[PDB]
Structures are given as C-alpha cells and as structure tokens.
Amino acid sequence: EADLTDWNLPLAFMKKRHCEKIEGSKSLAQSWRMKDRMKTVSVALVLCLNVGVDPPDVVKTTPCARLECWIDPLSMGPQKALETIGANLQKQYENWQPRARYKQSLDPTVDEVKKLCTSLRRNAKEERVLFHYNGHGVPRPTVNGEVWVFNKNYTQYIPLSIYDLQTWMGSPSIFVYDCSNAGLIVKSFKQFALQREQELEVSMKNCIQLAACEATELLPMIPDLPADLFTSCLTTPIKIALRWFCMQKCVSLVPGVTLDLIEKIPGRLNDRRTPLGELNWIFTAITDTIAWNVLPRDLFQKLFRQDLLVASLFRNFLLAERIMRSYNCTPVSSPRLPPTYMHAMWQAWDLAVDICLSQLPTIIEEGTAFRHSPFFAEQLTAFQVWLTMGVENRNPPEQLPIVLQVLLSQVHRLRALDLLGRFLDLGPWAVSLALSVGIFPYVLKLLQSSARELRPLLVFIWAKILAVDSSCQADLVKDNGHKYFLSVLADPYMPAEHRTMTAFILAVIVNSYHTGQEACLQGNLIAICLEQLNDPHPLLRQWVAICLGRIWQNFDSARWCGVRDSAHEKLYSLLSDPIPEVRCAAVFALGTFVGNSAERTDHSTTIDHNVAMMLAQLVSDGSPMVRKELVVALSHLVVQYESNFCTVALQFISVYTQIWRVLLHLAADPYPEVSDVAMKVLNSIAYKFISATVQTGFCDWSARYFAQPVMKIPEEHDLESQIRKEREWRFLRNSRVRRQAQQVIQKGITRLDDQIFLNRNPGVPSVVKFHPFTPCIAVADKDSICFWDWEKGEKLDYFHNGNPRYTRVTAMEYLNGQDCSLLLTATDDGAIRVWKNFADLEKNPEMVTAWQGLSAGMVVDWEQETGLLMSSGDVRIVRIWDTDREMKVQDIPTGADSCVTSLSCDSHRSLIVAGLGDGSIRVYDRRMALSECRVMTYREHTAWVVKASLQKRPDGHIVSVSVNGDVRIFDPRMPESVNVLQIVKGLTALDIHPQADLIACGSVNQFTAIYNSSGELINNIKYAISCLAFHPHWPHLAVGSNDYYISVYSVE
C-alpha cells in the first residue's frame, strides 16, 4: 500500500520553536516561603497540683486518678513529689524543645507568677514563651475570667485574673491549659483580647491557647488513665497512645498484650531503628498527614510548620483530641481546628501500632529480631499508585507528608526521592504543592550527602524546583549546593540527560545573581562548561552555552576567565551546529560576552572585533529566532561602542560599518518580529538611553522545557490518541485520492472543456498552486495571496504577503502536503516566508518562519522526502536550504550569465535541473564535488525557458519550453534532444503534469493548447494566460488570463 510512504516523511517546520511562540513563561506568585521563624526561647511551667489536699469543688473517688506526669505523688511525700513532677514535666518538654529556659513554678503565688512572667518576657521580648498551667489542685476557673493560685500560707486559693496574666505576658506567646473548665479560660482570654481591642481605639492572633476541655466539660476521672491527661498527650503522645490502644477492645484481636508489657517496651524515641523510635516516627508522619489533609494551607503553614515546639504541640493535640473524645472531653485551641478524630489515617495508625506491638512478646521473651514496619513502604506504594494515574489535577495525594517524612531516613530514601521526582514531573502545580508541604529545606540538606546514587534524583528534583521557582538560587548558593552541582556536571560517566539537567540548574542559579555568578566562577564552572561543550547532545550543548552566557553577564572577572580559557574561540564552533536551538544559545552567549567589555585594554577591543566579525557571517540564517538573538548581540555591541556607531552613522548621512550593514540587512527581514527589533535597535542609534536595551525571551522559553513533563510518553506515540487518529484518516484520504487519480488516468484522457467556475480576482493571478489532496488552490497576486476552492466556489482567505511594491511573488509551494500543510511563498527579492492556517475557519493567517534567500524573478523547488529546499533566481547561484537544520547546506555555482528561469528535481536522485534565460537547460548532481556538480549542458534554445520541468518517473524527460514555444524533451544520459516539437510562435506561460503527460500552453490570442508529449493535438480552448497549474494527482488544470479571472478544468 501507499500508507508507508506518508508515515516516513519528515514534517518541515513542525516543532516546538515553530508552533509555540518564543516567550518566557510568567512566574507565579510563590508563597511557599516562610514569612518568619519564631522560637520558644523560654517556657513557663506553673504547676498548681496541690499534692496531698483535694480541691473542695470536686469530691474525688476512693481510687481516683493519682498519676500526674507518670508519677504517683502520694508515695514519696508532698514536696518531693511536687519537685520531681516539675522536673519530669521539664524533661518531657525538653524532649521536644531541648534548648529553652525552663523556669518551673510549684504552687506559686500571684506575685511569684508575675515576677516569673515579667522576667521571661524581658529575656525574650519578641520570641514565643510557652506558659503551662495545671489547675488540678485548685478550684475551677470562674466565668469572670480568673485562675486560682495559692497564697503564702497555702490556706486559701487566691485568684489570678487572666487580664493581668496576659498583661504580664507579651503578644508573642502560647498558653497550654490543663484544667477542668479550660474552655472558660480560653473564652475569658478572647473576651479580654476584645476588650483591649475596644479600648485601643479611644494580641489576639499572636497568642495561641491549648485547652484540655470545653467550658462546660469536666476532665475524666477514670483510674486507669493519668490525672494529667492533656499534658501527657501533648508531651508524651506515644506512651499515652499505646496505653489508650491497650485499653480498647481492639486488644481482643491481639491476646497477650498488657500495660505491663508496654512499660517494658524496648527502644528509645530517637533511634528510628528501634520499635519505639519507629512508632514515634510513624505517629509523627500520621499526625502531619492528618494536619495537612484537614487544615487549610495557611493555617497548616502557620501552626505545623512555623516552629518545632508549636508544630509538635499541635501534632500531639490531634492525638489528644482523638483520645479525649472517647471520654466526653473536647480539647479547645485558639485557632479552631476542624475535627480530626474521624480521619482515615487514624485507622492506619491503629494498624501500624497493632503490627508493631504484635511482636513485642517475642522481643521481650525470646529476644528475636525486630522487623521494620511496612507502613512507610505501603504508603509509598499508595503514592506510586496515585502517580500512575495522577496526571489529572485531581485531589492532591494524602501521602505527600509521608514522602516528606520518609525522606528523612536512608532506609527508603532512594525510592522516596524517585517518587518525589516523578510527582514533580507532573507539572508546576505539583512542584508548588510539594514546596508548600515543606520539602525545600530537607531537599537542600540532602545536597550535603556524598552518596553517589542520590545525584540523579536530586538533580531532577532541583531542576524542577528551580524551573517553577527561580528564587531558590540564593538558598542554593548559601548552602554551597552549587559545589554539588558542579561535581555532578564534572562526571563524564553520568548520563547526558542528568548532565543537561544540572547545566540548567547552574544556569538558573547564576541567572542575574552576582553572588551566584561569583560563587560559580570560583568553582571553575567556565572550564567545566567548556569541557562539556562539544558533547553529542543538543540540549546539553544548548544549556551549557546558556550557562556560559549567563555567567559573564555584567561580570568582568568571568569574561577574563573565559578569555584566558579561549572561551569565545571554542564557542565559535556552536555557531555552525545543525540544531537551531544550540546556535541561538551560542549567539546569546557571545552577545552577553561582548556586552561587558567595560573599557579594557586593546586586547579586549580586538577580541570584541573578532566576535563581531564571527557573528556578522550569521546573517544568512534560516532560523528567525537565531537572527533575533543575533540582533540582540549587535545591540549589545552598539551599547559597548555607541560613539563609534554614531560616527559611522553620521558618516554616510571599517569594522563598525560591517555591523551597521548587517543590522540594516536584519532590518529588512522577512520576519516581522526580527525586522521590528532591528528597526528599534537602529532608531536607538540614530538619536545618539538604557531603556533601548531589549532582552529576548529565548532563555526563559528554553527553561520552560523543564517545567513540562518529560517522563511520560509523547502524545504522538499514543496509538489511540485523537491526533494520530486524525492523521490516519488524512493518510487514508490521501491514499484514496491517489488510487482514484491512478484509476482515472488508466482510463485515458478525454477532451477537457468543462469550466467548474469563473470568478474575478482583485489583482493579476501570477502563480497558481493546487493543494494536492484538499480542494484548495492558492493564487498569489502582486500584493495578496487568495485561496479559492473548486467545490464550494467561495473565496476562503485574502492575505497580504508583506513584500514591498517593487517585489513580486514568483515561486510558491505546499510544504507538508500530506498533512498539516504549510505554504511557502518566495518573492523575487529572495524573501522566503512560510504560512500556516491559511484555509481554516477558526484560525487566522499565521507566519511560521521566514528567511532571506539568495542575496525570471526567483524559483523554488521543494523536496519533501529529504526535507531539502532549493532556491535560485537572477543570481548565478543555486542555493540548497535545509529546513531541518535551517542552514544553507550546499552552494553549487550555476556557471552561466543568464538567470535561472525554472528549477526542478527528480525524487530519490540528485538531478537538479534548471532552465536558463539564455536557453540552456543545465543538470546538477549534488552527490559529487561542487566543481564537478555540472553534469550536462545542452543549448538548443535562444529565449527565456518558461518551465524546464522534470518527470518524477525513473526515465526522467526534461520537458523544456522557451518563449519561442519549441518543445525539446531531454534526458540526463543523452546530450541531444529526443523529441523536437513546435507549438506556438509566441508563448507566455505553461505547466506540466508529471503523472499524465499533458503539456498546457498559453497564447496571446486567448488560445490555450493542452497537448501531449508526442505533440498530438488534444484541445484548443477558446476564451494573456500568465498562470497555468496542474493538480499533482487529478487531471485538473487552472487557467488565469490577464484579466483577473480564475478557472479550473477537468475531464468530465
């Protein structure tokens, strides 16, 4: 079948740089940064336990609850018990905040608390101060807003107003209440804050309160639990959690587990390898997950991420709420947290505790080895499952804080980093979510690790983070992570993808950041980039060039280092790189290198001139983006040498003159954007300030690549995707069209006199080109390009090609005819421009690319199979433009004075033919050397060769016709004509059909002869015919007379 031919055809000018507009992605407002870092410098422990005496308000039961801070006061005397309880509570709080000035107050008086609070506030005027109160030994707070303490003789409880309590304290502070009606204390505190606010007109959000109970509710009195329950939850969450779990009915599932075994649990809270440390780690992760999933982002950042002590207190407050809900006790906090007792993660916590403590009897008795919990592994498996179909922006995964926690240890660090990188690959929203969770400091700390297996994952994560947010450069430079990135980039054994990832990271780090530029310069990054400049990888070279450009941006020391290393000479090689992106990056780097001369010695001037001349040979470039980067480079040149350019400009109203000529050439550029930039630059020189400098968005556009997902399969490879289905339908339609055309041709050719439609055009139809498959013909005028249809018979579009008056559209072609067709329109002056969306309903005309070629009119011959494009005209030169590399590949001399009137080629062979104005039809074979490219040259005409077209068949027969109208069919293997025919004395235009040997000619007397290769008369249509065109498949012919009428003919 013919389907394979369509599939294996490169699509010229169909890439990211052509489709997407070259601009930088707007940076989002990254609010993941922490606004301030508070610290609990001091902690106040006020313990009104009243050991040995029961408050009158509550009549305790005979067994009651005698456990305070895991201590039984009655067994060791009143004063000793009180002191040891204070010390134990201080130890418990130190477990979370070891560095803080703890000042215990044991049954104090109002004056004692006053002095303590005032001294602590004076010590820490702008830092958090924790105030812990235990009202177990004193009567309940009253509605008036007072807290009861003891007098000197301990004979009566004297009140302490909350108003004065917070007067002694400061705005930055957190209060922890362990009383019966602590909700009353919280309410009174809020009322006093409102009173202060009212009085101020003629400290509510800053203060944080944690209360054991609501105002009405009472603390539990069950003997099993400790009397001091809320503080036990806040400060020793694991012990109380295990005790509570052992008190539930779930123990029935696990016989042989008792509180006695819990008391003898091995391990400590720090070593995560031990059972108790693992349980603490799991509890921390579960509480963090619950807080992140339930609380809003702002409140979560304020509470669980501001400082260690408050975050731990609230993480344990979640457990306190869950535990005390079962006893008709509702803890209260100043910022009302939505309830978390029903969260699904508590079930996972229960399961993890069950699995951990199911092995405890074996550990205690048999002394077996403790197997690590599969909790983290299972959670990471769940995260991977979510990522499997997490492409859509659905609800964020609940395991992000779990990934954060598992990153801390090394048991699952590699898998955690891999999953995190996969998540960040999803897009900028994923990285924003990750940074909000708070991975940034820990990922930054990871760079200190010397483990060689972490380099790829870490560089992937950091490249993503820097792509979404560029403010991390300061943090990276502060932590000396750029040394880690340099070490990564200095390893040839590392895969190229990670090396270019690190190159992008370094480029972002030194992007307009003097500190980072200096740090990298002291890191010999210039040498590292130079050694890895010629690597066989387009993206790596592009980003190394971009990094080199950004290193010496307004940095004289970097420029000197590059000069010592001969950076410019080595970078010159990239100017010929086939990939346009690398060429643009090299041009940008050279321009930045030039822009910071800063009036150095004559050597600097010589090097600047050398770079200017090396860039001045880049004008004849196919890529408009590279030409724009070049224009920016010459603008930097002008800024460096403003006075010289001003003198040169005033001279005409020899180095700088050449650059002025280059800028003038770039000013009359086919691409509107490049022309506008060049004209702005020149006008900036005419009126001779800093505002004239303009920076293109190429660097940011390239940086946008790392923001997009890379791991996932491209949409093109997707077999069931809509785009591939549409392409398959288009190819099926093309195959059907070819089959129908072949069937029609096999039936012979009959007289074609049918006039499908007759219309009128605003201008003279110059060149008419048929779209091979879709029913559209592009008719080009002097100042417009019309697109008509021969089925609907309606004008579709009317362009303004953009060329000046003196110019004219001579040649036209249909790039990518099989699908996603473009229109190449080449004017007589050399300007070649490509159009897209030229016959669409919902899309306006678009310009893909354009580039001044060369520099009879001008002739163009597109070759889809090999992707080459050949241009010729009045010049004695046949240029060979390659759309893949967007550079002129070969330059075969014409070797004749006359202009090239026509141009054609034979598919699958190098048989470039060219009709000449004098009459000679020359054949060129590009396989051999340029001097021997000429193959044959036969001269049997003395007139302009209207069309020396070639037949695509293997036995190519060059049908050359001149103004004299004599047809002479030639062959590449015979220096003499095979068939000589004479048709019209005066000929104006003609076209030839490769599939059907039908030669359509014109006449001055309105005649239109459509004859055969044998010269047999077929038709003589009676109406200057200046444009004929044959549909490449159908036997369709379009005739446009001197009058602006367009007609298409067909055989029945």
């Binding site: 260690l308 975050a311 954060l404 801390l408 240890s409 820990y442 990871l446 690790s449």
Partner: peptide
C-alpha cells in the same frame, strides 16, 4: 527545621 533529617553524611 521542624523535623530531624538523619544519615546525611
């Protein structure tokens, strides 16, 4: 930092 990252070199 809120948490304690260990085993970092």
């Amino acid at each position: 930092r809120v948490f304690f990252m260990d085993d970092v070199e």
